[PDB]
Amino acid sequence: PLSPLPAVARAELDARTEREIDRARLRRADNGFFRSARDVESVSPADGHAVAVWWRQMTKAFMFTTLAGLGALARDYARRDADRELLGAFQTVYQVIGDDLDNAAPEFSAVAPTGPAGIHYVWWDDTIVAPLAAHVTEADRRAAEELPAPVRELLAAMDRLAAEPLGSAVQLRVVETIALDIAVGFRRVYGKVLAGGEPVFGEKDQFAWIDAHIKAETVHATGMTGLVTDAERGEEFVRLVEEYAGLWSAALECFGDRLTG
């Protein structure tokens, strides 16, 4: 009564989706955040702090709206009869959300704090934002929380995706493609923040959030297209990926702009 598309139609949805991500210029060699993170010689505490505050809000919104999007899919499946292949892909989304919410993967539980302190936006706030905030004034702290326009547009697409039954599939499909390059970028950026000529992040353990993400993405991610049940949902999927990818690309370009200002 409710099945994925045959594997041939799905494979072409995957090729259309990867071409969407190419066209959005989200690849390692294309996007201005990755290039700036390699290129800049140093990063000021104020610039690093501001990017860290933006990322905190973006990662918080990614986690909660992806879960909300799984909620929307669950409302449908409560009354329909999803077959096992659909149920397996639904499970994958649940477990991938669980990394950011509860450090389900052993790569994260080995290093993350326990309880709510380990939620990834909170863990980022405690170990990346806070030491940077020690080195910016109160004025700059308030200014950093006035999010730039491309960041607000991304957050708003995420709220729209929180209601879609395909929304958690779109978000995970784009973010898990770019997560590794984002985390490596962060490792390069925060390795270059100096205050008074000394590194703000001087101890290895201070990078634990970032090093854990780099390792989890190097190793790991029933794919996301396994949640598409017909042809016209497939069109909807590709259309939503193109939009969401574009907004991620523009948000990441704002990080690169802030590091080269």
Added chain:
Amino acid sequence: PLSPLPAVARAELDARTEREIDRARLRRADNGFFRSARDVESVSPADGHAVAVWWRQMTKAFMFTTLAGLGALARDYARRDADRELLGAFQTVYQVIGDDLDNAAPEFSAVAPTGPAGIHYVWWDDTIVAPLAAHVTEADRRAAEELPAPVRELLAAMDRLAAEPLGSAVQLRVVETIALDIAVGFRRVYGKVLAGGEPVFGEKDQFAWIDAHIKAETVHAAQVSDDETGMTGLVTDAERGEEFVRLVEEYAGLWSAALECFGDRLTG
């Protein structure tokens, strides 16, 4: 700018909740399903299959609508800033209902099938429904999926709670308290199903779903009434607390009628 109630009003609200589950006659001694499961001497394959099909549908809806309610709470936390106490109670919801969906807890992970075969309504369907189904008629299998009225009222309340930010807290707070007694009743009832002299579930392996739940539901019941990270920890003002009690009283009642409907099918 979003916090739980102080400890005293929270523990107060926990008392009214437990009194509503009392008044709804859901304790091991007050509900007719628990009585009848211990008291009946034998159960026919058709009656045991009917209850099994009903429970399949109820636990399917329970899982998916509690997940949907967690999504509705997540949508609100994406807009506001919840303090860490709220986020701890939120994690509990994700952890508890995540056992029905993927068997993370150790009691389930050792015995549950892997992948979608382990989703609890699927695992129930494969190991309880399907063996009973071999012993009833096609007409019996059709009739059993026409759910009784008290079961249909319960599902309709679940669908409403799927879109409430407190819905997952309501459903978990009630279902996780009575879950152990239901699993004990299932162990008694399906040990008593005879198909022409033969018991349909003779081997211990056949009770894997129920045995794991007898073990596991003791932890879950403690998880949802914990004073720091329990379900009332999701209530953020006094009026949300009243809406909570209102919704629990309703929800606990419909669970009673549906369960009493299980007992009647086993008796006369």
